[PDB]
Design a protein around this ligand. Sequence first.
Ligand SMILES: Cc1cc2nc3c(=O)[nH]c(=O)nc-3n(C[C@H](O)[C@H](O)[C@H](O)COP(=O)(O)O)c2cc1C
Length: 148
Amino acid sequence: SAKALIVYGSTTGNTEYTAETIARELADAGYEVDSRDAASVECGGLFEGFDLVLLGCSTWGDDSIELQDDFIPCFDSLEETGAQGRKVACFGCGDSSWEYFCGAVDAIEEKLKNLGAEIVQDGLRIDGDPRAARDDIVGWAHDVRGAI
Ligand SMILES: Cc1cc2nc3c(=O)[nH]c(=O)nc-3n(C[C@H](O)[C@H](O)[C@H](O)COP(=O)(O)O)c2cc1C
């Protein structure tokens, strides 16, 4: 039960760094971690074979909440990923200047719940430079593991 998948959408590298930091925490704890940029993934059956799935996505949109571009395809086809009964947790980078702070996390969590996933922890929301939030990221990964 030690297979973890991380799929992230990141344009300026912040959610990518966050994914790398989570991946190391899980691997140190004994998980076999498969980290993938959402740009590279196929949506059909994406979660197959994984005991834990972590989804990272930054938030965009001129005057609406939009997901990072590379994440949109598998969000649109999230019902084909194998999320039913899957343990999942979400993370994302954003900027609290925006009212809908890390709103992509809300959109992904709400759809996952409809699709029957088990959300193992409330999503991690990072403001600004994620390197300045490293302790929060490591602690969240620790807490996700402890809620399995
Ligand atoms: C047009 C635009 C819209 C944005 N909208 C939001 C937003 O609604 N909520 C939020 O938290 N951050 C918003 N941001 C901030 C980005 O999510 C932030 O730059 C983040 O660090 C990017 O993460 P990434 O490098 O992983 O893509 C917006 C940024 C831009 C340029």
